[PDB]
Design a protein around this motif. Sequence first.
Motif, PDB file in Angstrom:
ATOM      1  N   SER B  51       0.833  -1.194   0.000  1.00 34.26           N
ATOM      2  CA  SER B  51       0.000   0.000   0.000  1.00 34.26           C
ATOM      3  C   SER B  51       0.872   1.250   0.000  1.00 34.26           C
ATOM      4  O   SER B  51       1.886   1.308   0.698  1.00 34.26           O
ATOM      5  N   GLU B  52       0.467   2.245  -0.790  1.00 32.86           N
ATOM      6  CA  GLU B  52       1.142   3.542  -0.857  1.00 32.86           C
ATOM      7  C   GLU B  52       0.110   4.670  -0.818  1.00 32.86           C
ATOM      8  O   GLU B  52      -1.071   4.450  -1.094  1.00 32.86           O
ATOM      9  N   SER B  53       0.563   5.877  -0.487  1.00 29.87           N
ATOM     10  CA  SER B  53      -0.300   7.053  -0.480  1.00 29.87           C
ATOM     11  C   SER B  53       0.314   8.178  -1.315  1.00 29.87           C
ATOM     12  O   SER B  53       1.515   8.440  -1.227  1.00 29.87           O
ATOM     13  N   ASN B  58      -5.120   6.840  -1.234  1.00 28.12           N
ATOM     14  CA  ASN B  58      -4.512   5.580  -0.789  1.00 28.12           C
ATOM     15  C   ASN B  58      -4.789   4.459  -1.775  1.00 28.12           C
ATOM     16  O   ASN B  58      -5.915   4.299  -2.241  1.00 28.12           O
ATOM     17  N   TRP B  60      -3.849   0.231  -3.169  1.00 26.61           N
ATOM     18  CA  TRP B  60      -3.393  -1.114  -2.846  1.00 26.61           C
ATOM     19  C   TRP B  60      -2.950  -1.789  -4.139  1.00 26.61           C
ATOM     20  O   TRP B  60      -3.641  -1.702  -5.154  1.00 26.61           O
ATOM     21  N   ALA B  84      -5.633  -0.605  -7.164  1.00 23.07           N
ATOM     22  CA  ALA B  84      -6.930  -0.036  -6.816  1.00 23.07           C
ATOM     23  C   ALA B  84      -6.795   1.081  -5.796  1.00 23.07           C
ATOM     24  O   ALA B  84      -6.003   0.984  -4.865  1.00 23.07           O
ATOM     25  N   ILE B  86      -8.342   2.994  -2.691  1.00 23.93           N
ATOM     26  CA  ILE B  86      -9.201   2.600  -1.589  1.00 23.93           C
ATOM     27  C   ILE B  86      -9.922   3.837  -1.070  1.00 23.93           C
ATOM     28  O   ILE B  86      -9.342   4.654  -0.355  1.00 23.93           O
ATOM     29  N   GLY B  88     -12.875   5.031   1.176  1.00 23.55           N
ATOM     30  CA  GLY B  88     -13.685   4.486   2.260  1.00 23.55           C
ATOM     31  C   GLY B  88     -13.554   2.975   2.290  1.00 23.55           C
ATOM     32  O   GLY B  88     -12.438   2.439   2.212  1.00 23.55           O
ATOM     33  N   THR B  89     -14.689   2.285   2.372  1.00 23.39           N
ATOM     34  CA  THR B  89     -14.719   0.825   2.322  1.00 23.39           C
ATOM     35  C   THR B  89     -15.084   0.309   0.920  1.00 23.39           C
ATOM     36  O   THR B  89     -15.646  -0.780   0.787  1.00 23.39           O
ATOM     37  N   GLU B  90     -14.743   1.081  -0.116  1.00 25.05           N
ATOM     38  CA  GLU B  90     -14.967   0.680  -1.505  1.00 25.05           C
ATOM     39  C   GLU B  90     -13.673   0.809  -2.310  1.00 25.05           C
ATOM     40  O   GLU B  90     -12.728   1.486  -1.893  1.00 25.05           O
ATOM     41  N   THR B  91     -13.636   0.159  -3.468  1.00 25.79           N
ATOM     42  CA  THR B  91     -12.448   0.167  -4.315  1.00 25.79           C
ATOM     43  C   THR B  91     -12.751   0.643  -5.720  1.00 25.79           C
ATOM     44  O   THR B  91     -13.899   0.644  -6.164  1.00 25.79           O
ATOM     45  N   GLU B  93     -10.549   0.588  -9.782  1.00 27.44           N
ATOM     46  CA  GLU B  93      -9.389   0.246 -10.599  1.00 27.44           C
ATOM     47  C   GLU B  93      -8.580   1.456 -11.041  1.00 27.44           C
ATOM     48  O   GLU B  93      -9.132   2.525 -11.287  1.00 27.44           O
TER      49      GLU B  93
END
Lengths: 150, 151
Positions: B51-53, B58, B60, B84, B86, B88-91, B93
């Motif tokens: 993972s990177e920011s 953010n 993955w 992908a 990230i 919130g809690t969704e992704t 491409e």
Amino acid sequence: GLAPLADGEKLYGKKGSEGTVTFTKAIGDNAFVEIKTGADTGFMNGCLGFSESIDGKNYWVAYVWQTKKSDTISIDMSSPVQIAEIIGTETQEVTDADTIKKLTDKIKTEKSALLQVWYASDKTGKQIDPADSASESIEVYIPSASADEA
Amino acid sequence: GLAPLADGEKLYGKKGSEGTVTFTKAIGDNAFVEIKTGADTGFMNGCLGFSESIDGKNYWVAYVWQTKKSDTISIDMSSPVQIAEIIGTETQEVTDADTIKKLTDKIKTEKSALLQVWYASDKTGKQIDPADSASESIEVYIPSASADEAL
């Protein structure tokens, strides 16, 4: 099964080597991720991972979670957020609602899962590497048979 | 790189709890995944995860591997296969070649990675649950500086 549960109803999974988590029964509709954050940790996220196969084709499926404090996150096993077919060493997104449902049904009968921490950062917003180190503990549980009857 | 290396050139990563793997230097262009399969295992696959920011956002990133026998898989750190953002809690491409390169550069400076086995099956094609149990051992290594001083 979205509001976290009392200690006598919690059925904890046992943690293996590569971040595996194993239960004595099938997982069902709801899992709960219990996180105690470090102290200087401002943000964490990760997922619960599964692989299934459907006549020749292999898929990988992730349910994502996140948090900024110590908490229990309830995860709906019917609502995965990342699905991909693994073709050789490459991936392909799956948006087909019929394929997705077939996978969730099979996942609901599983006894083990994969727990991963992806990204974490401290209170100043600076990344914590490795992410894993941002938490004091992480467990996963599912409801008891009792608690299930309500 | 791509061709596996002799024992004196291999720099092994140390394995942590949640399947973490940690090296004493930055990973660089090439990683090698060493797998000894179980006797009844016909297929295995998995990945190396990061993972990177990048200014607020953010991501993955996964590099995928597979095998049907005991082997060493060489993984090109410039060639990730799943990316992908990230939110919130969704992704979602990422196909933007400029964003992808920025991520690979940052990944090449990392000292740890995530090792995951996803799916495995026996010789009759029947799944092995959990996948992890299909192997006798899995390690990751990178080349020594000497091996690199070559090129």
